[PDB]
Amino acid sequence: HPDISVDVLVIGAGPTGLGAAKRLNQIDGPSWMIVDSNETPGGLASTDVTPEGFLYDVGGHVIFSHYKYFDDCLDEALPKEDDWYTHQRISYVRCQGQWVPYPFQNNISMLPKEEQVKCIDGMIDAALEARVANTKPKTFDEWIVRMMGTGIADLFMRPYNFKVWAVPTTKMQCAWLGERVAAPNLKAVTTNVILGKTAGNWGPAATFRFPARGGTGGIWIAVANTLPKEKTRFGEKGKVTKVNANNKTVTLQDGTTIGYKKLVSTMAVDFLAEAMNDQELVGLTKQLFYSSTHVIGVGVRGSRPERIGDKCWLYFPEDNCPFYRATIFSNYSPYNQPEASAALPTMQLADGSRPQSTEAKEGPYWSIMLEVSESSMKPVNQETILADCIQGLVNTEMLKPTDEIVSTYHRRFDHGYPTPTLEREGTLTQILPKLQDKDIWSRGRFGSWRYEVGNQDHSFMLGVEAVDNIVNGAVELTLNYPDFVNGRQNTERRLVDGAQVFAK
Amino acid sequence: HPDISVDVLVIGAGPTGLGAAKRLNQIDGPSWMIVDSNETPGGLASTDVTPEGFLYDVGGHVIFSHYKYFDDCLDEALPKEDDWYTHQRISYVRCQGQWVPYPFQNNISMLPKEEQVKCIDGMIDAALEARVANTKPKTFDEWIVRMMGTGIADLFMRPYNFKVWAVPTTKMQCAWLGERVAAPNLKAVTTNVILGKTAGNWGPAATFRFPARGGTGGIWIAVANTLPKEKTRFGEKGKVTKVNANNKTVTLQDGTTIGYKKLVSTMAVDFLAEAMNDQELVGLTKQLFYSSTHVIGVGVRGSRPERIGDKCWLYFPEDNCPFYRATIFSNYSPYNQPEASAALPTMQLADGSRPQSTEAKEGPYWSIMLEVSESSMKPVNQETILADCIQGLVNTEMLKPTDEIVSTYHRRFDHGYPTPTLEREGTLTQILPKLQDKDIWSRGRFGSWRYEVGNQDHSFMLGVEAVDNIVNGAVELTLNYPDFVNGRQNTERRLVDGAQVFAKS
Amino acid sequence: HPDISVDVLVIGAGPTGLGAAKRLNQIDGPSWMIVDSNETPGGLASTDVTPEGFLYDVGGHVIFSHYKYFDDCLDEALPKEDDWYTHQRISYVRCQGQWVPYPFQNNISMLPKEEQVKCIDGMIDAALEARVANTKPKTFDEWIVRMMGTGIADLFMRPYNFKVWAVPTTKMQCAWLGERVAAPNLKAVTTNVILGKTAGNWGPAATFRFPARGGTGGIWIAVANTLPKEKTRFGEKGKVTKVNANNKTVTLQDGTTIGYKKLVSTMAVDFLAEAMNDQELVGLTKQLFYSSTHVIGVGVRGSRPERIGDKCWLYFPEDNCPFYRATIFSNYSPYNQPEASAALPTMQLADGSRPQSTEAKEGPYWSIMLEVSESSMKPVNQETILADCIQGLVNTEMLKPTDEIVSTYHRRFDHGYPTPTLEREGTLTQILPKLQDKDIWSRGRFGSWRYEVGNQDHSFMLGVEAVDNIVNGAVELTLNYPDFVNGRQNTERRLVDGAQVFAKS
Amino acid sequence: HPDISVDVLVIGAGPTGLGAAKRLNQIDGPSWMIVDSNETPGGLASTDVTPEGFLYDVGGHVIFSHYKYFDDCLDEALPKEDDWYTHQRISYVRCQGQWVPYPFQNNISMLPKEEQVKCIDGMIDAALEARVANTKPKTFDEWIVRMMGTGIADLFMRPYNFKVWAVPTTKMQCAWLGERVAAPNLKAVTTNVILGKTAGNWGPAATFRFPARGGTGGIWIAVANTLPKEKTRFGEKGKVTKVNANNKTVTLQDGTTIGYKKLVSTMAVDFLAEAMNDQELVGLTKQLFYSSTHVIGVGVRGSRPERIGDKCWLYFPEDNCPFYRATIFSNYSPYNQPEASAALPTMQLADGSRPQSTEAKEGPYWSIMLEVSESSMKPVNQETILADCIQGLVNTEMLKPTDEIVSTYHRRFDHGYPTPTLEREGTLTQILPKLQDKDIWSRGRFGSWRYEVGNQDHSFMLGVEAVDNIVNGAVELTLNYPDFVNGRQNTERRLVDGAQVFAKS
Question: Which residues of C touch A116 (CB under 8 A)?
């Protein structure tokens, strides 16, 4: 008989696992337990800090919540108004020397006139074709061009998406974008071109909140802390090494065995198939595709340059830089980098030069966070990528050659994006029902591998809904119907439900 | 303090209310109680019997379940195999002296050739227009025309639907439609006309099960029997007369008061507004529309005639009869009518005349159940409707003039169909949230007034999900997303869920 | 027996009749003669002069020739290079204080940003509707909206066309406009908006030639002069009063009778019906519609103003002036107005005041020619129309308040435009074949009433082709197929054909 | 100075040349003469006779006239009523053991049901595509499929047209087919299928007349005979061997030289280029494409079989026979074959066996005329083609194995069809203008190489209009605008025009 027995075991304490745990904790029915190999919960929603005191998330993390329940747990965890900062959702596309407001097509007035002509002509073709279309697009590429036309597609979404996904747009499905018809808003686009108008999709209503301290990672430490500590096992002692699906037994690295009746696994599903020693599942998970993410962080001396201003995140379709996205992380919280009086030496100038002096000087400081994707179709030279990113910062006029870099950061995350390939659904609908037959609920960004429900709130709710299905017979809506949950505000499920009110 | 206090009060013990009850009973958390003014649970899913021993449902009731939870509760209530009879879903449309397999719009093949031309020409126009359409249809009529063309619309869809809904197709919305009206492929319809093929949509997979005894009403009597009796109050002692929403207090006819934390109300929402003495809610509910259903039953002497055969239900678009639908109710169970040795005198011949003898004679017997709709746009002469129906049976050749009728039944059900009018949703999105703000879950066929989720399984689950929302913060999917629940197999929620498994150890 | 007998009698010596006479004269087979009530041939293609020496055509007359035959005859009649001046076809549309290059609908790029949006949005709508359109437009208005969208329709097409046709766009057909109304290309128009460019000249017409002396009327005086004088009868002596179609006899006002075998009538067909004393025909011609043309002439002291420059004709859709078109007639020939040394007193200033003195001062002089339409749907105040035009010239900034006016001219031409009404073709197909069966070829701008073949070259060729049909069995292509003759270069028929070349041997 | 001088020389006395000659003769102006290498006029519109007395045209020749002038000349040539026979235009398609009335698609109810399904499914696809089409088809093959859909295309027009043109449908243009939109009449086709109806496109109105004697060739003998004999030169004495364009001189085989001012050439334009010894033109003409025609005649003993009946011509898409078209030539005139009392021996039975006797036996007789095409893409074994044709008659059940054949006929015509290749116009617009610059009017079926104006009436009028262009400056409509002349009733040009009427006074 096992060392420990619980009704429901949760593997992994990123957002998905912590969602499952919060719901089990609230229900307070079946016994339960959560394990993670890391001492610190959060998964890919964690945060690092450099020796010089610059924080970096695992790339740009901006919360948009589709669920009251998710909101309830964040409010519980970080309940003070000064636990958070609010910002507008300000983003731009870098294109031919210009910062073009997102969405790109509504702002092509900034481009040269001859190019505007090409863009409008292409979108006219797409509008005329959309008017008689009687089939759905089958690939991401087809969807892009039917929405945007050839010209606008070639400038942004085609080269941008290869830089992000590390696979061509022709090899991805397009159902994950939702059920919106692939057609141009020709009038809107042409109107701004005629008016010479620019317009971003943000304002006092289009906002996000970001944690005052600890980066995105601070949220999940705070949420985890609301759980009964004896029901958690985090660290080397919590690393899962073996899953015996037939005996419903799990073995940890230190040899501890855990028996379960139901399993919620939030580890990557290809790792799960190995831990199970299931040759059939290993073969199937190997049919899936993912990209790795390099996160590069750069700490810069000086007050925030006028050219940067209130920018939050930025897209880079062009090939003069390796990164697809940059984040002005110092704009998210004053505590993402040291205060102005902190003294740091200059490590190098942006052009690669040595500084005049080695003396530690004061701030203030700002901070840029970069993302570079990697796959077997898009290799990344690990040894030069930092320097390539810094050159890319100069090329894109984010840094001057003279800017003083005081901190650098580079980390590679093996599983970064689960790719919406054409083959994905054919594979997942074999994998997930086989796990289900064994009472294994494999869920999460890489637990169930669906990018369109792959953010923090989706993940958290995948765990919540998994538990609700296990206990109360709930439909796993986020898992099976992304369009459904993304197109509504999910208000019904709360951190305090009728059941707990009636109980007291 | 009131006579009784419960966390959750359920008003009504038709399928919706019973569903609430069953889920509350399964959860076994909050205290609850269920009331009904009728001693026998079942609502519009009840069954009547004539003095001569012929059973009649409230019109044609055929079960198609979208939910394993519903299946579970029926199986629990009627667990034996001989509790049920299984049949194929055989229906036809009476059209110009002939029985056309349902769906009509696919058996074009069976009409006079000249009419086939008319139909196919119309459908060709519709196919070409559909090729360039970029707007959705706004009315039931526009929808019908767009998917079938004028010829088929006129021959069947338009007249039949006025006969059922008792309002013209131009007066109804079309969002409710996915699962009720078949949209014909031009190539499929044309292929069947060329091949001279008649192809109805039934067979070994498309079946239904019907209770062996007690009619459809037998289900809900048995389901109710699985509830703890003390938590029920059925009869005059359970008739709700006043609802004080602000004090969260209900008053019954005998004067009993019941306090509640949450209310699940399954009575017609216009009745609820009146019981609340809420003039604003009364005015809103009056913007809703419903039709009444007349149910007529006819018991016939004789073994089942060949011309009837295995027919289950039948549609009547034409003018030679007042009913829109007939059910061969004696095909559903042998216990829906007397055994063959039962002796019964003839009451009349089908042609209206007196029988040659008034002596009681033996069977066998078969049985027809007819439905006639009524509204302010379609008045019905209540005094002659029985005789009109019987003449309609002679007219459609279902009865011979000389057939011997041994039993008759007629009952009017005031609230029969909640009409999907153009105005329905604008009104409901005022009514339901205003009740919601008062912790009142108004749910069911007339509780929430949505016909597209108005069958027995829909109703039952409206009750279940209401409770699940109240207790576990579940999404009321059936209520707000008919297309979602009707388009899938709903397997997740069971009569035994993990909660009960884990608790019992 | 009548006073005169010819094989072919030609009535009218405008372009159409002169066309007939020239071809008859070239063929030199059948006997013929041509009559006109006017001593000076030319009809609506004539020219007046004011006592102060300013010439005015009957409104803006610019020649574009579709036929080599027409070229040959103009060349014969006015053979010297200094008989002609050549000009670029420079026109603009007055809109919101701006001059928009013709055609308006292709130069959206010139309007304010706000108006550009309204225009392009409209054109996008039209482009998308046109992608799935399977019916041709019935009316001029439907055509305008289908091809240009509501924005350009409201801003220019609808007001301008009522102002010139003197009927709403909804009352006209749209089969006539292939060569008159440009259909805008969405990509092309949008591309020029983005680049802020003007559009390439619509049509093959880049320049035009205009006669050095006598205005447009000089051409027809000279063409007529090439005819044998004995075969003409112009003046009171040549006015037709009676046409006896059954006797094939024509009576002139002086009592002269002319018997004919074939008749080419170029007078207005409604007048012809009257002269025929044919009540049925009069009835039919009254189903036709026409507008009247007021021509207003204004002679101005001064060297040609910079704001005027090389402008030729100008369009005015706006309601701040009565005229639909202005022509800088002084740009067409130096001899359309007096020498600079000619001394003329100021008659009035453009603001309407009397001048300081009666002193005759020298020039130079320039000249504006205006057109105002009239019909039963659009009355014109004859007594004030001159002053209204002059104020119009001030509102449109064509004249400064202080500009000195040295000559004025006003003349009303009752039949100005044959209106392409919805009813036109139905009526003409009852009229023209009836006349045909009586050996009457009724042809010309009002002879056959078809504006799309109603220019000088068209008219001339209607007379030529009518004679060719009569003598050589030719197809009357211009009469029956406007799109055919307007869409090709008609090079085959010449002033010297093979017949004449061989015969001279 | 040449042996003979004329103003206009016409080469060739087939229909085109005779048209030119008839119009020259009528105009009676410029001097002219017509030459031909054959003593008998008619060209490809001539008629042969076998030693047994069976006549054969050059394949099926049926007159549909688009011109009054053509009717005038035919009626002048053969003015008596008994010079002609009148018949309805009765034709069928041989398909899967059936004679299917033309047009094929309106008669597919004769096909097996499963095949009707595939045909109608294809045409539904075609109609749905046509509804949103925004481009014209570019090839004959695209035109066929857009009009018929795949299934119907594969059964008739695709395999049939390869058998006719001896080139694939994918290699031909489709503009020659005219301006009608390539689109299905889906309602018409489905209606006849639903009704089980067959219907040909003939009846009392849709008739042709055929000469009573001498076949089609009789027409042109009679027309030629109205010409003044001394202006003709037919036979070896009239064969042109050299054309010197730069000197406007023609040389005949007997050494006679003719000087002309204008040349109308109706010989094949590739021969003309060789005769001109113009290397550039020879290169260009070699870019053109044409098929050769084999004509096979079979004379059969017996009264007309019931299975043949009133059939006139027949299409053969299938590959169980080499011919694309058959004509029941004995149905055109009783004088196309010997009278019944004429005695002929049997040459063979249709299955190839010897007759039991070689005695002459009497008739009556009927007659079949067949056409086989030949090109480099589709060779013909001249040695076996007769035997293959006769086997084809058995395969198609036109002849029984036992039918007695009393006469056979085979002749190959090198220039048979001028092919409407994709490249044709690109080449012709280089050839015809260069010849035009030399005062050479190259006109006719192979004179101008355009099949869509390649019938007898078209050809005759090409000559007429060429002369009219030379003399009177007429537009050459038939040459340059096939759609125009084929879509109208051409009634203006007559054998007696005004010119002749007036001159005779």
Answer: 194
